[PDB]
Paper text:
Microtubules are cytoskeletal filaments that play various important roles in cellular processes, including intracellular transport, cell division, and establishment of cell polarity. They are highly dynamic tubular polymers assembled from α/β-tubulin heterodimers, which are arranged in a head-to-tail manner to form protofilaments, with ~13 protofilaments associating laterally to form a hollow polar tube. In vertebrates, both α- and β-tubulins have multiple isotypes encoded by different genes, which are intrinsic factors in regulating microtubule functions. The GTP bound to β-tubulin at the E-site (exchangeable) is hydrolysed within the microtubule assembly proceeding via longitudinal contacts with α-tubulin, while the GTP bound to α-tubulin at the N-site (non-exchangeable) plays a structural role and is never hydrolysed. We determined the cryo-EM maps of α1A/β2A, α1C/β2A, and α4A/β2A microtubules in the dominantly populated 14-protofilament type at the resolution range of 4.2 Å to 4.4 Å.
The tubulin isotype α4A is highly expressed in various tissues, such as the heart, brain and platelets, and is mainly expressed at later stages of development. We then built the corresponding atomic model for each of the maps, including the non-seam region and the seam region. Similar analysis of the lateral interaction between α-β and β-α contacts in the seam region suggested that the α1C/β2A microtubules display a subtle longitudinally contracted divergence between α1C and α1A in the seam region; the α4A/β2A microtubules also display a slight longitudinal contraction (Cα atom RMSD of ~1 Å) between α4A and α1A in the seam region. Taken together, our data suggest that these α-tubulin isotypes do not show obvious lateral effects on their microtubule structures, while α1C/β2A and α4A/β2A microtubules exhibit slight longitudinal contraction between the interdimers in the seam region. Due to the longitudinally contracted divergence in the seam region, especially between α1A/β2A and α4A/β2A microtubules, we further compared the structures of α1A/β2A and α1C/β2A and those of α1A/β2A and α4A/β2A in the longitudinal orientation. Surprisingly, similar analysis of α1A/β2A and α4A/β2A microtubules revealed a clear contraction of α4A/β2A relative to the α1A/β2A protofilament. This contraction mainly exists between the longitudinal interdimer, consistent with that observed in the seam region. Our structural analysis revealed that, compared with α1A/β2A and α1C/β2A microtubules, α4A/β2A microtubules exhibit longitudinal contraction between tubulin interdimers, which could potentially be related to more amino acid variations between α4A and α1A relative to that between α1C and α1A.
Numbering used by the authors:
A (entry chain B): 2 to 36, 52 to 443
B (entry chain h): 5 to 329
C (entry chain R): 1 to 426
Write the structure that this text describes.
C-alpha cells in the first residue's frame, strides 16, 4: 500500500507545503525529518531513523520552489525532488506544453519510473494542480498523457481549482480550461473540483473569518485530501482503498467529474457550544451552500455519493442518518442509481494543526458526489468562451506559441458533446 | 465595381502514407456546385475531384484571371489548406514536366503566348519578384545577402515591398530559370507527414506593365502568386526544435487572415489587416481592385477529418466577401 | 532565472531610469557604493534578476545608459547612486540631435548602435537565462525617440522571441515642451506598434494633475514626478524579485493584457497616493485602495476612462493581505460599472499579490490598464501632426538627413490605424 503524488503550478505547491505539514504531524514526524505501518504509504524509511515523502514538487517558475528550499520544511523533503524550471507559462496552455514543456518533462518522466520501481505497493497517482492558470493546464495535461501510455491501468485522481461564475483571478482562464479539458476527458479516471469563491464562503458564514488568506484555504483542503486516503493509513472497521473512488463514483467512462464537500467546519469558541454528532454533519454536508462549488445541487440529480467518516463513530447512526437523507424530498436522486450510497469509517480521528484556524473535532466526514449540477457550469464556461472566441480575442498568443485555430474548434465541439451528455444521461 | 471572391475546392488522391494506414474515402461530390462531407453540404463555385489533372484545374479556375489582369485590373491567386492537402502540387507542380506543371508556369506561358497574338504596338514591360518568409523576416531568394525587407505605402496607400529583387524579363524561358532558381534555394524540411514540406509562404509577384504607342494609355497589373503552408498538428507531424519554430511562424498568417476574412464576413468596422505582415501584402487582394480567387485544398482521408471541416467553413465564409473593384 | 537587462534612451529615460535604480536599491538594501546592508535574506534571493554580483559582496546594476549628448551622463554619474553604475556602460556621443528624429535614427544613430549592441550582447551573455528587456524613453525630442526606436528594431532582429517591454512617456496638448513633438510622436509609434509586445503610456500632464489633488505638493520638481513613475516600474517586476502567494511575471501580465498583437499600449497607475499632512486620517486596508485604483484622477495618463471601456485590467499588489477582501473588491468594481467594461470578456481584472511590500508602506498596488479611451490622446497628436504636415511645415530639416516625405505619410497611415482599432472594440 503506497501512492505517489505530484504538484504542478502555483496552486499545486502552495497547498502541497500546506498538506504535507498536516501529513507529518499525524505520524509524529518532526519537521527536521524524523520522529510502523501507517506512515509507509506516504513516507519511506531511509536506512535508520530517517524518512522522505513519496512525492515530487514540479513547477516551471522558480520563486515557489526555492521558497521551499529556503523555507522551514527544508530538511523534510529531498533536495533533488524540488524540481524547478527557467521560463514561466504565463497563463498559456501551449507554452508549458510544447516550447518549455519538452525541455523539462524528460527529467520528470524517468524520476517517476525509478520512484515506482523501488516501490512495490503502488496503488496509483494523484495530481494537485489548477487549470485556472498556465502551468497547471499545459504541463499537467502533458505528464498525464505520457504516463498513461506507460502505466494506463493505474488510477489518476485529479485535484483542480476551477474558476467561479463571476469571481476570477485571471482573464484568459476559459481558453486555459477549455484546452486542457480536451485531454482530461479521455485519460483522467476521476477529477475532484473546488471553486475559489465557495471556499471563501465556507470560512465566512461558519468559521466567521472575514479576512483569510490562501494559507487558510489549504488547511481545510488538506483535511479533504488526507481524509480520502485516511483509510489506507490507519485501521478502520470498514476499509476503503484508492480504487474504491473509481468504480463507485464513475457511472460512465467519460462522466468522471465528482464534487467535494466537508463538514464540520466550526471555530474554536463555537466548537465548545455546538454539539458534534452524525446527524447534524450529515444534514450539513448535503446542504447546498456548504459545498465547495457554486452549483445548485437541486437543479441536478446525484448519480452516486461516497461517504467516509473519521473518529469514534459507530456504524448504526451512519446508517440511520443516510436513511433520513433518503426520506428528504428536497433532494432528488436519479433513477439510474438509487442505492448511490457508499459509507466508510476510520478509527483515527481528524487531526489539528497547532495554531490553525480549524478547531478540534471528535468526528468528521468527507462527502464526494457526482451529479449533473455542473452541467450549467460547463455551459457557463462554454458560453463565456464563445464571447471571446467570436471576437478571436487572446488567440495571437496561443498561435504565437506553435498551435493554430484548428484545435480551438476541437475543444469547443468537445464541450458541446460533453454538455449534451450530461443532459441526456440525467433524464 | 463589386465582385465576389471565387471559391473553389479540390480533393486529391490518397498519398502513400494514407492508403497504407487504411483511411476511408470521405469525399462525396454533388455536381460542381457543392460537396458533401458526412451529410453536410458546402456550396462553392467549382469542386475538383481526385481524377482532375493539372491542366483541367488551370483551364477552369486561373484561365479567366489572365484576361482580367491584362485588361487593366489586378488579379490574385492563392491557396489555403492544412498539411498534405496538395497546395504545391496544385500551384507549383513539376516545373520541368509538361503535364505535372502547376499554375505558375501555366500562367506565365499564357502571358507571352497572349502577347504574340496581340498587335505589335502594345509594349509590355514585365518584371518578376520572389521572396519567402522565415522567422518573421522576408528573406530574398534571388539574392542571398539580404534576409529582411520593409513594406511601404504608395500614393493611394496600396502596400508594396521595397528593396526586393526586380528582374526585367523579356523571354518566357528566362522566367522558368528564375522560378527554378527559387526552388533550388527554397528551404525544405523533412517531417513524418510531408517530405517536401513547404514551411514558408512563396510569394511570386509579377508587376505586368503595358503601354500603347498609338493611344498613349498606360496600364499595369499586380499578379500575386502566393502558396500558403499547411497548419501542422504537432501530434501528427511531430514538430520539434527548428521545425516547431518555423511551424509557429506559418501559424501566424493562417490565423491572421482567419481574423481578417472572418471580420469581413460579418462586415466589421476596421477590418484589421495590420495584425500580421503577411496580411498586409494581401490588402489589395481582399479589399482592393484585384479579382481574387481562393482555391482551398482538402484531403479525402478521415485522419484529418476535422481539419477538412475547418477549411470547408473557411471556404464558405470567403464567398460572403466582396472586393471593391 | 529570468534576468532583465535595463536600457535607457533620451534625457528623461536616463532620469527616470536613474530614479528606477534608486528606489529599488532601498528596498533591496543596497548601498550607494554597491555593498549590501539590508536585513532580510530574501533581498539576495533574487538580486541577480537586475544586478550582477561582484567581489567584496558588491552588486553592480545591469544597466546601459545611452544618450547622444555627454552632459546627461555627467548629471547621472554625479547623482546619489551614480557611482554604482559600471563606467564601461556609460556610452554616449558628442553632438546632440536637437529634437530631430531623422538625426538619431539615420545619421547620428548609425554610428553609435554598433557601440551599444556589443555591450548589451555582453550583458545578455552574462546572465543564465534572460526573460526580456525594459526601456525608458520619451516620444518627444530626437534622442529618446530616435535612438530608442532604432535599437528596438535591432533588438527585435537579435532577440525576436524574448519579451520587449517599454515605458514610453508621450506628449500632451496643454503641456507642450517641444515644437516638433507631434512629428516625433507620429514617427515613434510606427516602431512601437509593430516591434515591442508591451508599452506603458505615461503622460506628463497627469503627472502634474496627480500631484495637486492627493499629494498636495506646493513646489513639485521633476524628481518628485520621477518618484511616481519609478515606483510603477518596480511594481510590475515584484513577484520575480520577492516571493508571493500568486506570482505574475512580465509575461504573465503580458498574455492577459495584450489581447491582440497591436493592442498593447497600457495605462499605468499607483496607490496609495496620500500627502504627509493627511496620512493619519486615512486607512490602509484593501477596499480604499481598490476604489482609488479605478478612480479617474489616479492614473498618470490624461485619458478620460469614463469616455470609453476598459479592455483588460491588471492590479499587481504588494504586502501581506487577505485574499477574500482582494477578490471580492474586484467583483463589484466590474459589476457596478458594467457600462465602462466590455461585455465580450467575462472578467477584465488580473489579480496578483506579493508578501514583501516597499519600505515605509504595508499595503500597496500598481495599476496596468488597456482601455479604448487611449485613442483620444492619439488623435490629438495626429491632428497636430496632420495640421503641421499638410503644409509640409518643419520637414526640410528631416529631408537633409535623407528621410523621405512618404515615410511621414506611412506613419500617418499607422496613426489613424491604431486609433481605429480601439474604436472597433468600443
Ligand atoms: N517626469 C519627468 N519628465 C521629464 C523629466 N525631464 C524631462 N521630462 C519630460 O520629457 C520631455 C522630453 O524628454 P527628454 O528631456 O529626455 C528630451 P531627450 O533627452 O530625449 O533629447 P535631447 O535632450 O534633445 O538630446 C521633456 O520635454 C519633459 O516633459 C524628468 O526628469 N521627469
Ligand atoms: N484555492 C486556491 N487557489 C489557488 C491557490 N494558489 C493558486 N491558486 C489558483 O491557481 C490559479 C493559477 O494557477 P497556476 O497555473 O499555478 O498559476 P501560476 O503557476 O502562477 O502560472 P504563471 O502565472 O504562468 O506563473 C490562480 O488563478 C488561483 O486562483 C491557493 O493557494 N488556493
Ligand atoms: N492532385 C494530386 N495528385 C496526385 N498526387 C498529389 C496531388 N497533390 C499532391 N500530391 C502528392 O503530394 C506530394 C507533395 O506534397 P505537398 O508538398 O503538396 O504537401 P503540402 O500540401 O504542400 O504540405 P503543406 O500543406 O504542409 O505545405 C507529391 O509527392 C504528390 O505526389
Amino acid at each position: 500500500r503506497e501512492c505517489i503524488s505530484v504538484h504542478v503550478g502555483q496552486a499545486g505547491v502552495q497547498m502541497g507545503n500546506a498538506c504535507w505539514e498536516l501529513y507529518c504531524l499525524e505520524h509524529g514526524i518532526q519537521p527536521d525529518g524524523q520522529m510502523d505501518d501507517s506512515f509507509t504509504t506516504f513516507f519511506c524509511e531511509t536506512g535508520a531513523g530517517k524518512h522522505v515523502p513519496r512525492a515530487v514538487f514540479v513547477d516551471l517558475e522558480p520563486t515557489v520552489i526555492d521558497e521551499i528550499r529556503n523555507g522551514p520544511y527544508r530538511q523534510l523533503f529531498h533536495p533533488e525532488q524540488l524540481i524547478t524550471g527557467k521560463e514561466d507559462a504565463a497563463n498559456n496552455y501551449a507554452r508549458g506544453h510544447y516550447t518549455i514543456g519538452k525541455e523539462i518533462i524528460d527529467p520528470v518522466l524517468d524520476r517517476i519510473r525509478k520512484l515506482s520501481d523501488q516501490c512495490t505497493g503502488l496503488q496509483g497517482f494523484l495530481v494537485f494542480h489548477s487549470f485556472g492558470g498556465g502551468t497547471g493546464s499545459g504541463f499537467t495535461s502533458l505528464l498525464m498523457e505520457r504516463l498513461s501510455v506507460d502505466y494506463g491501468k493505474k488510477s489518476k485522481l485529479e485535484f483542480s481549482i476551477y474558476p467561479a461564475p463571476q469571481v476570477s483571478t485571471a482573464v484568459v482562464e476559459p481558453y486555459n480550461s477549455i484546452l486542457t479539458t480536451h485531454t482530461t476527458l479521455e485519460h483522467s479516471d476521476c477529477a475532484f473540483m473546488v471553486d475559489n469563491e465557495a471556499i471563501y464562503d465556507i470560512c465566512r458564514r461558519n468559521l466567521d473569518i472575514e479576512r483569510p488568506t490562501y494559507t487558510n484555504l489549504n488547511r481545510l483542503i488538506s483535511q479533504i485530501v488526507s481524509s480520502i486516503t485516511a483509510s489506507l493509513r490507519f485501521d478502520g472497521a470498514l476499509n476503503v482503498d484508492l480504487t474504491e473512488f473509481q468504480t463507485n463514483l464513475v457511472p460512465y467512462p467519460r462522466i468522471h467529474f465528482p464534487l467535494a464537500t466537508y463538514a464540520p467546519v466550526i471555530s474554536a469558541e463555537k466548537a465548545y457550544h455546538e454539539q458534534l454528532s452524525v446527524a447534524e454533519i450529515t444534514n450539513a454536508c448535503f446542504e447546498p451552500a456548504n459545498q465547495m462549488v457554486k452549483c445548485d445541487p437541486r437543479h441536478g440529480k446525484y448519480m452516486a455519493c461516497c461517504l467516509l467518516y473519521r473518529g469514534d463513530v459507530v456504524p448504526k447512526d451512519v446508517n440511520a442518518a443516510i436513511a433520513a437523507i433518503k426520506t428528504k424530498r428536497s433532494i432528488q436522486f436519479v433513477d439510474w442509481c438509487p442505492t448511490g450510497f457508499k459509507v466508510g469509517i476510520n478509527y483515527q480521528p481528524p487531526t489539528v494543526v497547532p495554531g490553525g484556524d480549524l478547531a478540534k473535532v471528535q468526528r468528521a466526514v468527507c462527502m464526494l458526489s457526482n451529479t449533473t449540477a455542473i452541467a450549467e457550469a460547463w455551459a457557463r464556461l462554454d458560453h463565456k468562451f464563445d464571447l471571446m472566441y467570436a471576437k478571436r480575442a487572446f488567440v495571437h498568443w496561443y498561435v504565437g506559441e506553435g498551435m493554430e485555430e484548428g484545435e480551438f474548434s476541437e475543444a469547443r465541439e468537445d464541450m458541446a458533446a460533453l454538455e449534451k451528455d450530461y443532459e441526456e444521461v440525467g433524464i | 465595381a463589386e465582385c465576389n471572391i471565387k471559391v473553389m475546392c479540390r480533393f486529391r488522391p490518397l498519398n502513400e502514407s494514407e492508403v497504407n494506414r487504411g483511411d476511408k474515402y470521405i469525399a462525396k461530390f454533388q455536381g460542381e456546385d457543392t460537396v458533401v462531407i458526412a451529410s453536410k453540404p458546402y456550396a462553392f463555385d467549382r469542386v475538383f475531384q481526385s481524377s482532375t489533372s493539372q491542366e483541367q484545374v488551370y483551364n477552369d479556375c486561373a484561365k479567366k484571371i489572365v484576361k482580367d489582369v491584362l485588361e487593366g485590373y489586378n488579379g490574385t491567386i492563392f491557396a489555403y489548406g492544412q498539411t498534405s492537402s496538395g497546395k504545391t502540387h496544385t500551384m507549383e507542380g513539376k516545373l520541368h514536366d509538361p503535364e505535372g506543371m502547376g499554375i505558375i508556369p501555366r500562367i506565365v506561358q499564357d502571358i507571352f503566348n497572349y502577347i504574340y497574338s496581340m498587335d505589335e504596338n502594345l509594349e509590355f514591360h514585365i518584371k518578376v519578384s520572389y521572396f519567402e518568409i522565415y522567422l518573421d523576416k522576408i528573406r530574398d531568394l534571388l539574392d542571398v545577402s539580404k534576409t529582411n525587407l520593409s513594406v511601404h505605402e504608395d500614393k493611394n496607400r496600396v502596400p508594396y515591398v521595397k528593396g526586393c529583387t526586380e528582374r526585367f524579363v523579356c523571354s518566357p524561358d528566362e522566367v522558368m530559370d528564375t522560378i527554378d532558381e527559387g526552388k533550388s534555394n527554397r528551404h525544405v524540411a523533412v517531417t513524418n507527414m510531408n517530405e517536401h514540406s513547404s514551411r514558408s509562404h512563396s510569394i511570386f509577384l509579377i508587376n505586368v506593365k503595358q503601354e500603347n504607342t498609338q493611344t498613349e494609355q498606360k496600364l499595369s497589373g499586380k499578379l500575386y502568386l502566393v502558396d500558403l503552408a499547411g497548419s501542422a498538428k504537432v501530434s501528427k507531424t511531430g514538430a520539434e526544435g527548428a521545425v516547431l519554430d518555423e511551424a509557429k511562424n506559418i501559424n501566424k498568417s493562417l490565423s491572421a487572415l482567419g481574423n481578417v476574412i472572418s471580420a469581413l464576413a460579418e462586415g466589421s468596422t476596421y477590418v484589421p489587416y495590420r495584425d500580421s505582415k503577411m496580411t498586409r501584402i494581401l490588402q489589395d487582394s481582399l479589399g482592393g481592385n484585384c479579382r481574387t480567387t481562393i482555391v482551398i485544398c482538402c484531403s479525402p482521408s478521415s485522419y484529418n477529418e476535422s481539419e477538412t471541416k475547418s477549411t470547408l467553413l473557411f471556404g464558405q465564409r470567403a464567398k460572403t466577401i466582396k472586393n471593391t473593384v | 532565472m529570468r534576468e532583465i537587462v535595463h536600457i535607457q534612451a533620451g534625457q528623461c529615460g536616463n532620469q527616470i531610469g536613474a530614479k528606477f535604480w534608486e528606489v529599488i536599491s532601498d528596498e533591496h538594501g543596497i548601498d550607494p557604493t554597491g555593498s549590501y546592508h539590508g536585513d532580510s535574506d530574501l533581498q539576495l534571493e533574487r538580486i541577480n534578476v537586475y544586478y550582477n554580483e561582484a567581489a567584496g559582496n558588491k552588486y553592480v546594476p545591469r544597466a546601459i545608459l545611452v544618450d547622444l549628448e555627454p552632459g546627461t551622463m555627467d548629471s547621472v554619474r554625479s547623482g546619489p547612486f551614480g557611482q554604482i553604475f559600471r563606467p564601461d556602460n556609460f556610452v554616449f556621443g558628442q553632438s546632440g540631435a536637437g529634437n530631430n528624429w531623422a538625426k538619431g535614427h539615420y545619421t547620428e544613430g548609425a554610428e553609435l548602435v554598433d557601440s551599444v549592441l556589443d555591450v548589451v550582447r555582453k550583458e545578455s551573455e552574462s546572465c543564465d537565462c534572460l526573460q526580456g528587456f525594459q526601456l525608458t524613453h520619451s516620444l518627444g525630442g530626437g534622442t529618446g525617440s530616435g535612438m530608442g526606436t532604432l535599437l528596438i528594431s535591432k533588438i527585435r532582429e537579435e532577440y525576436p522571441d524574448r519579451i520587449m517591454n517599454t515605458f514610453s512617456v508621450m506628449p500632451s496638448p496643454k503641456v507642450s515642451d517641444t515644437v516638433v513633438e507631434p512629428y516625433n510622436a507620429t514617427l515613434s509609434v510606427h516602431q512601437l506598434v509593430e516591434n515591442t509586445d508591451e508599452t506603458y503610456s505615461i503622460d506628463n500632464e497627469a503627472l502634474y494633475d496627480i500631484c495637486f489633488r492627493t499629494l498636495k505638493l506646493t513646489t513639485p520638481t521633476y524628481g518628485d514626478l520621477n518618484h511616481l513613475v519609478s515606483a510603477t516600474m518596480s511594481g510590475v517586476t515584484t513577484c520575480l524579485r520577492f516571493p508571493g502567494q500568486l506570482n505574475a511575471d512580465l509575461r504573465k501580465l503580458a498574455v492577459n493584457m495584450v489581447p491582440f498583437p497591436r493592442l498593447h499600449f497600457f495605462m499605468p497607475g499607483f496607490a496609495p497616493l496620500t500627502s504627509r499632512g493627511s496620512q493619519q486620517y486615512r486607512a490602509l486596508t484593501v477596499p480604499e485602495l481598490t476604489q482609488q485604483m479605478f478612480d479617474s484622477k489616479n492614473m498618470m495618463a490624461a485619458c478620460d476612462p469614463r469616455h470609453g471601456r476598459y479592455l483588460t485590467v491588471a492590479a499587481i499588489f504588494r504586502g501581506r493581505m487577505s485574499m477574500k477582501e482582494v477578490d471580492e473588491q474586484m467583483l463589484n468594481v466590474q459589476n457596478k460599472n458594467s457600462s465602462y467594461f466590455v461585455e465580450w470578456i467575462p472578467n477584465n481584472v488580473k489579480t496578483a499579490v506579493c508578501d514583501i511590500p516597499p519600505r515605509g508602506l504595508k499595503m500597496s498596488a500598481t495599476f496596468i490598464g488597456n482601455s479604448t479611451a487611449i485613442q483620444e490622446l492619439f488623435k490629438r497628436i495626429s491632428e497636430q501632426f496632420t495640421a503641421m504636415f499638410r503644409r509640409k511645415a518643419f520637414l526640410h530639416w528631416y529631408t537633409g538627413e535623407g528621410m523621405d516625405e512618404m515615410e511621414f505619410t506611412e506613419a500617418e497611415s499607422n496613426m489613424n490605424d491604431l486609433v481605429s482599432e480601439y474604436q472597433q472594440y468600443q
